[PDB]
Ligand binder design. Structure first.
Ligand code: P5S
Ligand code: PC1
Ligand code: 3PE
Ligand code: 3PE
Ligand code: 3PE
Ligand code: OLA
Lengths: 691, 568
C-alpha cells in the first residue's frame, strides 16, 4: 500500500518507549530538571540544526510539489484564523490577545521533527521518499508565517500590560518577527537554503561525516528530552480550563487534519488519482502530531498561563499515540479485500494485546509488591486488571492457533470471551463499589460476594448457551466465531454494564526529644493511616470507568448495528476496529492509570556543608515539630517544609536536587525519621533530627 | 589499500569536531558542569546498553577469527604485567598498589565505543565488515579480565587504611568483582550473550526500531559529552607528574600498539598475507585510541589520585588525533606505488592545512583583540600567523585549481611560495630582534619585515627556468626551486645557531617557538639536501617528505600552543 502499516507499531513503539524512558528517568530522579536542561540545550543548539543542514542542502527543489505545500499552509492558516476569531469573540478582555496569540500556535504548530519524522520515515522509506522532503519543507515554512502573527498578538497583549509609546512598528512587529528569526527553526533554514543555492546540492565529503554524526543523534535524544520534560506537568485544571483544553486538543488533532485532507483533495490536480489519494491521506496523518516543544517554550518566555499550553502538550501526545494508530489504519482500510481486512484486524489486535499485556504484567507485579489489598477497593481493581491480562493472553493464544486444531481446543481458547465479558461487567462492578463508597461506612455489600459475582460472570451461562447453541462454521474472527447469538449475549451483558455505570454516575450526582520509639512517635500510626488514605485513589478509578463508558457505548452500538441490519458498508469494519482497540488496549489505559502512578565522599561534603552553614540558618525554625508522639512536643518535622526551605532561599534549585540532598543527609547521619528505620522521601511525614 | 584513508580525515573531523563543539560549549558555559550530567546518564544508562544490545544479538560467533581476539588480549595483558611491576618497586610504598591498580588499567583501556567505532567503521565499512565485530569483542572481554586485577589492587590501598586481618573474601575479592558487574557496559555483555542464544541471533521487530532509534543516538552524544568533561581538567603538575604522564601515555600510544602489531604477526596464520597485513595494521590501528573516561571516573569512585588520570584523559585525547592519522599513513606507504604516494603526500598536505588554519584564525584574532602590536617581539609573531595563514591558504588551491587549468592558475601559487619562504625568513629576522633584546633597531628590522627577499626569487619563477610538472611546491620545475629552497632556510638557521651562544655569552616563550620550528628547518635542511646529493627515496626520503609536509603545511599547530591557553 501507500503506507508501511506493518511498520506503524514498531515506529510508534520506538518513539513512545524512548519518551517513556525519559518520563521514568525524570520520575526516578536519575536526571533532575536542571540536568535535563543540558540535554535540552544540546538538542536545541547543536543536534537539530545539523539535521536541518544535512537534509536541506541536498534538498532537490526541482522535483517538489508546491501545490500540496501551499495546501497545508492554507489549511493551517484557516485553522489559525478560525480559532483566533472565536477567541477574540469570546475571551477575557484582559487576556483575549494572549489567548488569540497562544491558542492558534498550539492548534497549528506540531512536533514534526522529533515525533513526526520517524513515523513518516517508517511509513514512507520505500514507498514515497519525497515525503521526507515535504516534512522538512512544510514545518519550517509554517514556522515563518503563523507563529509570527501569534507573537504579534503576544506583543498586543504586552502592550495591554504596558501602555508603551505608539510602537505600531517599534514593538508590535519588531520583537514579534525578531522572536521568529532568532529561533533555530527560521534562521538556520535561511542558512541552509543559501548554502543549497551556493552548492550544487552536494554537501562536501569532509563535512558530510561530521554532519551525519551530529544529525543521526537528534531523534532519540529529542524524544528522551520530551520524556524528561513531560514530568510534573499534568496539574489540576478548572472546568473552564478543562473545557478550553479539550476544545484546543480536539481542534489540533481532528479539525486541522481533516481541513488539510479536504484542501489536498480539492487543490491537487495531478493526473495520477492513486498518488493524489496517497498524498491526501499523508496530509491527514499530518496534523494529528502533537504540539512541538516550541509552543511550550514560547508560552514560558512570554510568561503567559503556560499551564494550559504544557498540559495541552502532554494530553496531545498521550492521545495522539492511539489517534495516529487508528487514523492511519482507517486510512489504509478502504482498499483491501474483506479477508485481508479481517487478517489486519487480527494482526493489530494481536500487537496491541501483547504490548498491553506486557504493561499489565508490570502493573500486576507493582500491585503485588504494593500490597494495597487491605481495606481498599484496590482488590477488585487489580482483579479486573488480572482479567484484562487474561483477555490479552487469550488474544495471543487465539492468534497462533486459529482456523486449525480441533473444535475442542478452539473453544478452550475461545473461553477468553468469558474473561472479556468479565472485564465489561467488572467495570460495572467498579461502578457499584464506588456506589457503596458513596454510601455510609460498613456497606451491606461485602467484598467476597462482589468478587464471587464478578468472576462468577454469567459468561459461564454464555458457555452453556454456546454448548446448546450452533457450532462454528467459519470462525474467521472472535466476533463472527460460532453465529450471531453471541452477539446478542455481548450486547445484553454490555448493556447491563453500561446501565450500572449510569446508575453509579447518577449516585455520583446524588520527655525524650532525641529518641522517639515508644514513649514518642505514636503519630507514626496516624501518618501511615494518612498514607493509606492517600493510597485510596478511587478518583483514578472514576477516571477509568468514565473513560471506558464511551467505548462500551461504541461496542454496543456496533452490535446493535449488526443485528439491527445486515449491511456492513465498511462502516462496521471501523466499528469492529474500535471494539478491538478497546478490548485489547485496555492494558494501555490501565498502565496509564496504574504502574506509572504514585504510592561516598560526596555525601560527606554534603553533610558537612549542611551542618556547618545551613544548620546555623535557623534549623530550629526550619525543623518545625509539633507534639512528637505522646511525650515530647518538638521531636520530628515534615519533609515538605524542608524542601520548601531548600527551594525558597536558594539552597537547592528545585525539589529534585533537594530530595537528593535530603537523601545525602540521611546517608550522612544528619537527618532521621520518626521510627529511625525509614528513609527520607519529602512528604508530610514527620522526620527526626539526628545529631 | 584495504583501509580507505581518504575517509580517515572525515572520520577524525567528526570524532574530534564534535567533542570540540562540546568543549567550546562547556567553555561558553551554555551547558554547565552540573547540567552536563543530564547527558552523561543518557549515554551511559540508555544509549550505550542499546547500542551493545543490537549488535551482539545479530553477532555471529562461528564466523570469528579467535586468533586476533586473543592477540590483543595478551597484548593488553603483556602491558598489564609490565607496568604494574615497574610501579610496584619504584613508586612510593604508601600508594604502590594504587599506582599498580589504576595506572595499568589506565594504559590498557580505550575509548572503543565513543572515539573508536566511527573511525574503525569509516575505514572498514565495506572492505572488512568483520572488523566491526572485534571492536565489540576485544573491548568487552578486556572489561572481563584486566579491570578485576586492577580493582582488587585498589583494595590493598583500602587495606592500608583498614588493616583488619586479610579480608580476602570480604572486600579484596568481595568488592573487586563488584566494581566489574555493576559497570553498565560489562553486564550488558552477559545479557546480550544470553539473548544471543535465546533468540536465533535476531532482534524482535517490536523493539528493533527502539534499539536502532536509541543505538544511533550514542555516537553523536558520547563524543559531545566528552567535551564538557574536558573543561577545567588540565592543571599544573610539572613538579614530578608530567614525566610519568608521557610514560603512561606512551604505553597506550606507543608501547601497547607496537606489541599488538607484532604479536598478531606470530599468532595469526591466515593464508592471505594481504588480509593478515590488514589484520596486522588493524592490530596497530587498535590501541592508538585514547583511553576511555571510565578510567578517569574509576578514580573518582576510588577517591585516590585522579589528576594523573583526568589529565591523562585530556592529553591522550588530543595526542591520539595526529598519531591515529600520521601513523596509519605510514603503514599504507609501502603498499602503494610512488604515483599515488605523490598524490598521498599532496593529499596529506591538503589535510593538515585545513585543521591548522583554524588555530591560525584563533591565534591571529586573539592577539588583535589583546593588542599584541606592543614593542615586544610579539608584533613580529603576529606577522608569522599572517605569513602562516597564507601557508595553508594555497594548500586548498592545490586540489580544485592546481593539477589542471593554466600556468596562470599555477602562478597564483607564487604568493604561497613567497609566503612559504616568508615564514622561513620571518622566524630568522625574529631572531634579529631578540638578538638586540639580549644585547644591552626594530625600524631596520621593520623595513626588512615585509621586504621579503623571497620576492627576489620572484624573478626566478619568471626567468630562472620554465615550469616543470608542477604537482607539488618542491615538484615544480627541475630542482632549481629546491636550490633556492636550499638557500632560503639555512640563512635563517645560521642566525639562530649563534643566538643561543649569544644568550650564553611572553617574550621568553617566542624563543621556544623558534626552537620547535628550528628542528623542522633542520629536518627541511636534510629534506633540502638529500635530493641534491641523490634522488633516491630508499624508503627513508619518502618519510621526510611526509615530515616535510607536516612541517611546511601545518606549522601553526605548535604556534597556537604559545598563544593558546593564556587568555590575557
Ligand atoms: C570542515 C570541518 C568539518 C566539521 C568539523 C567540526 C566543525 C566544528 C564547528 C561546528 C560548529 C560548532 C559551534 C560551536 C560554538 C557554539 C555554538 C552554539 O551552541 O551556539 C548556539 C547555536 C544554536 O542556535 P541558537 O539560535 O543559539 O539557538 C536558540 C535556541 N532557541 C536555543 O536556545 O536552544 O548553535 C549553532 O547552531 C552553531 C552550530 C553548532 C553545530 C550544530 C550544527 C549546525 C548546523 C548548521 C550550520 C549552519 C548554520 C550555523 C548557524 C550558527 C548559529 C550560531
Ligand atoms: C616497523 C615499525 C613501524 C612503526 C611506524 C610508526 C609510525 C608513526 C610514529 C609516530 C610516533 C608518535 C610519537 C608520539 C609521542 C609520544 C609521547 C607523547 O605523548 O607526546 C605528546 C607530547 C607530550 O605530552 P605531555 O602530556 O607531556 O604534554 C602535555 C602538555 N600540555 C598539557 C601543555 C598539552 O605532547 C605535546 O606537547 C605534543 C602533542 C602532539 C604530538 C604529535 C606528534 C609529535 C611528534 C612525535 C614524533 C613523530 C615524528 C618523528 C618521527 C619518529 C617516528 C617513530
Ligand atoms: C462544535 C463542536 C465540534 C467538535 C470539535 C470542537 C469544535 C469547537 C468549536 C467551538 C469552540 C468553542 C468556543 C467557545 C468556548 C468557550 C469560551 C469561553 O467560555 O471563554 C471563557 C472561558 C473561561 O474564561 P475565564 O474563566 O474568565 O478565564 C479562564 C482563563 N484560563 O474560557 C476562556 O478562558 C477563553 C479562552 C479563549 C476563548 C476560547 C473559545 C474560542 C476558541 C474556540 C476554539 C475551538 C477549537 C475547535 C476547532 C474548530 C474551529 C474552532
Ligand atoms: C516489547 C518488549 C518489552 C519487554 C519488557 C520487559 C523488559 C525486561 C525483561 C526482558 C529483558 C530485556 C532488558 C534486559 C536489560 C535490563 C537492564 C537492567 O538492569 O534493567 C533494570 C533496571 C535497573 O535496575 P536493576 O539493575 O534491576 O537494580 C538492581 C537489581 N537488584 O530497572 C529496574 O529494574 C529498576 C526498577 C524499575 C524501574 C523501571 C520501571 C518503570 C516502569 C516501566 C514499565 C514498562 C516496562 C515494560 C515495557 C512495556 C510498556 C508498554
Ligand atoms: C628499587 C626500584 C628499582 C627500579 C625498578 C623499576 C625500574 C623501572 C621504572 C619505570 C621506568 C621509568 C623510570 C621511572 C620514572 C618515574 C618518574 C620520575 O622521574 O619521577 C621519579 C619519582 C620518584 O618518586 P617516587 O618515590 O616514585 O614517588 C613520586 C610520587 N609521585 O617516580 C615517580 O614519580 C613514580 C611514578 C609512578 C611509577 C611510574 C613508572 C610506571 C609507569 C610507566 C611504565 C612504562 C612502561 C614502558 C614499557 C616499555 C616496554 C618496551
Ligand atoms: C597535527 C594534528 C593533525 C590532526 C588534527 C586533529 C584535529 C584535532 C586537533 C587538536 C584539537 C585541539 C583542542 C583544543 C586545545 C585546547 C583545549 C585544552 O587545552 O584543554
Amino acid at each position: 500500500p501507500s503506507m508501511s502499516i506493518t511498520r506503524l507499531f514498531p515506529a510508534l513503539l520506538e518513539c513512545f518507549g524512548i519518551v517513556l524512558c525519559g518520563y521514568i528517568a525524570g520520575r526516578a530522579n536519575v536526571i533532575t530538571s536542571t540536568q535535563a536542561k543540558g540535554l535540552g540545550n544540546f538538542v536545541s543548539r547543536f543536534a537539530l540544526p545539523a539535521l536541518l543542514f544535512k537534509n536541506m542542502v541536498v534538498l532537490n527543489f526541482s522535483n517538489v510539489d508546491w501545490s500540496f505545500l501551499y495546501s497545508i499552509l492554507i489549511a493551517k492558516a484557516s485553522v489559525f484564523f478560525i480559532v483566533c476569531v472565536l477567541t477574540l469573540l469570546v475571551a477575557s478582555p484582559d487576556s483575549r490577545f494572549s489567548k488569540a496569540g497562544l491558542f492558534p500556535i498550539f492548534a497549528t504548530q506540531s512536533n514534526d521533527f522529533a515525533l513526526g519524522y520517524p513515523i513518516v520515515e517508517a511509513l514512507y522509506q520505500t514507498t514515497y521518499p519525497e515525503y521526507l522532503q515535504y516534512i522538512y519543507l512544510v514545518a519550517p515554512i509554517s514556522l515563518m508565517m503563523l507563529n509570527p502573527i501569534g507573537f504579534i498578538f503576544c506583543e498586543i497583549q504586552k502592550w495591554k500590560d504596558t501602555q508603551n509609546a505608539s510602537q505600531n512598528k517599534i514593538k508590535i512587529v519588531g520583537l514579534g518577527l525578531l522572536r521568529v528569526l532568532q529561533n533555530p527553526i527560521v534562521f538556520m533554514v535561511f542558512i541552509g537554503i543559501a548554502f543549497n543555492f551556493i552548492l550544487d546540492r552536494k554537501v562536501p565529503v569532509y563535512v558530510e561525516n561530521f554532519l551525519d554524526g551530529l544529525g543521526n543523534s537528534f531523534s532519540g535524544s529529542a524524544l528522551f528530552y520530551l520524556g524528561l520534560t513531560m514530568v510534573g506537568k499534568i496539574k489540576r485544571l478548572k472546568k473552564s480550563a478543562f473545557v478550553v483544553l479539550i476544545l484546543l486538543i480536539t481542534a489540533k488533532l481532528l479539525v486541522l487534519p481533516l481541513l488539510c485532507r479536504e484542501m489536498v483533495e480539492l487543490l491537487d490536480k495531478g493526473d495520477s488519482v492513486v498518488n493524489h489519494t496517497s498524498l491526501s491521506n499523508y496530509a491527514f496523518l499530518y496534523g494529528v502530531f502533537p504540539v512541538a516543544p516550541g509552543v511550550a517554550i514560547f508560552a514560558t518566555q512570554f510568561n503567559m498561563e503556560v499551564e494550559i499550553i504544557t498540559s495541552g502538550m502532554v494530553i496531545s501526545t498521550f492521545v495522539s499515540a492511539p489517534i495516529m494508530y487508528v487514523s492511519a489504519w482507517l486510512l489504509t482500510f478502504p482498499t483491501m479485500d474483506p479477508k485481508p481486512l479481517a487478517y489486519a484486524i487480527q494482526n493489530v489486535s494481536f500487537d496491541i494485546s501483547i504490548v498491553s499485556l506486557i504493561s499489565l504484567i508490570w502493573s500486576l507485579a507493582i500491585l503485588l509488591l504494593s500490597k494495597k489489598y487491605k481495606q481498599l477497593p484496590h482488590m477488585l481493581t487489580t482483579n479486573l486488571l488480572i482479567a484484562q491480562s487474561i483477555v490479552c493472553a487469550g488474544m495471543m493464544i487465539w492468534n497462533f492457533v486459529k482456523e486449525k486444531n480441533f473444535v475442542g481446543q478452539i473453544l478452550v481458547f475461545v473461553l477468553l470471551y468469558s474473561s472479556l465479558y468479565s472485564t465489561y461487567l467488572w467495570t460495572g462492578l467498579l461502578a457499584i463499589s464506588l456506589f457503596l463508597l458513596k454510601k455510609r461506612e460498613r456497606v451491606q455489600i461485602p467484598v467476597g460476594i462482589i468478587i464471587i459475582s464478578g468472576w462468577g460472570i454469567p459468561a459461564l451461562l454464555v458457555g452453556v448457551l454456546l454448548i446448546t447453541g450452533k457450532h462454528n462454521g467459519d470462525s474467521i474472527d472472535s466476533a463472527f466465531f460460532y453465529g450471531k447469538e453471541q452477539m446478542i449475549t455481548t450486547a445484553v451483558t454490555l448493556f447491563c454494564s453500561i446501565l450500572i455505570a449510569g446508575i453509579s454516575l447518577m449516585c455520583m450526582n446524588q520527655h525524650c526529644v532525641s529518641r522517639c520509639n515508644s514513649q514518642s512517635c505514636i503519630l507514626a500510626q496516624e501518618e501511615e493511616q494518612y498514607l493509606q488514605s492517600g493510597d485510596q485513589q478511587l478518583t483514578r478509578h472514576v477516571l477509568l470507568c468514565l473513560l471506558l463508558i464511551i467505548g462500551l457505548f461504541a461496542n454496543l452500538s456496533s452490535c446493535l448495528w449488526w443485528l439491527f441490519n445486515q449491511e456492513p458498508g465498511r462502516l462496521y469494519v471501523e466499528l469492529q476496529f474500535f471494539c478491538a482497540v478497546f478490548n485489547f488496549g485496555q492494558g494501555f489505559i490501565s498502565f496509564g492509570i496504574f504502574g506509572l502512578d504514585k504510592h561516598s565522599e560526596e555525601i560527606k561534603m554534603t553533610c558537612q556543608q549542611f551542618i556547618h552553614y545551613h544548620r546555623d540558618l535557623c534549623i530550629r525554625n526550619i525543623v518545625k515539630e509539633r507534639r512528637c508522639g505522646a511525650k515530647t512536643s518538638a521531636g520530628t518535622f515534615c519533609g515538605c517544609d524542608l524542601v520548601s526551605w531548600l527551594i525558597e532561599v536558594g539552597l537547592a534549585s528545585d525539589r529534585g536536587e533537594a530530595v537528593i540532598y535530603g537523601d545525602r543527609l540521611v546517608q550522612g547521619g544528619v537527618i532521621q525519621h520518626i521510627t529511625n528505620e525509614y528513609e527520607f522521601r519529602d512528604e508530610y511525614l514527620f522526620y527526626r533530627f539526628l545529631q
